[PDB]
Write a protein that binds this DNA or RNA. Structure first.
Lengths: 114, 116
RNA sequence: ACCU
């Protein structure tokens, strides 16, 4: 997996307002860590869960447009950031645009006070 | 009980799969204090933490050595690569607080891990 | 999904 790619991930079981079920997520961990996790068969990668509920788009969230990829308009929730074992990766879906990824970088900086 | 950035809490990470950090262990709050304040006020929602381990054999650039001289009983390292948002109900107990210097390091460790 |  690579940073910017959209993957179907298994987030269950989730507690409280943690994003649940099997849903798309954007890889945001750097590619050196991603490359290290793949071949070794261990380690974690970091992803940003995605939701179809787009009634509100907070500044720490990024609107993703449906393309081949996501079938409906969605928003990436940087506040839902989560490091997961690679075995949670189910399906490759596609990748966000460079514009969407650049926005996600800013959303992550904002959320993590970086 | 307000959780603040830089503070250390006993968090419940179970159940975990694969190489995911597990069990009930210390973690450093790294989400901004606006989100944090909102989370306590509403009694729900997610805040973001960085898990901590006592296995300090090697400290990677995306990891930060935390001195016991923290609330932590022994020397530990914060694993920015294990960062995850958690529901407030996973917050069990406040433990302590990292120094301003250690937190700055953690910010740098977060930037490196997340390519920011 | 829900909450922000």
């Amino acid at each position: 997996m690579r940073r910017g790619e959209i993957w179907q991930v298994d987030l269950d079981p989730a507690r409280g307002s943690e994003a649940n079920n099997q849903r798309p997520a954007v890889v945001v961990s750097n590619d050196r860590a991603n490359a290290t996790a793949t071949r070794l068969g261990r380690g974690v990668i970091t992803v940003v869960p995605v939701t179809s509920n787009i009634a509100k788009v907070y500044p720490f969230q990024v609107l993703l447009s449906a393309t081949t990829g996501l079938q409906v308009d969605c928003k990436a929730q940087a506040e839902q950031i989560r490091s997961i074992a690679t075995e949670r990766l189910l399906r490759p879906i596609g990748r966000v645009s460079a514009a969407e990824l650049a926005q996600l970088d800013e959303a992550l900086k904002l959320h993590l006070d970086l």
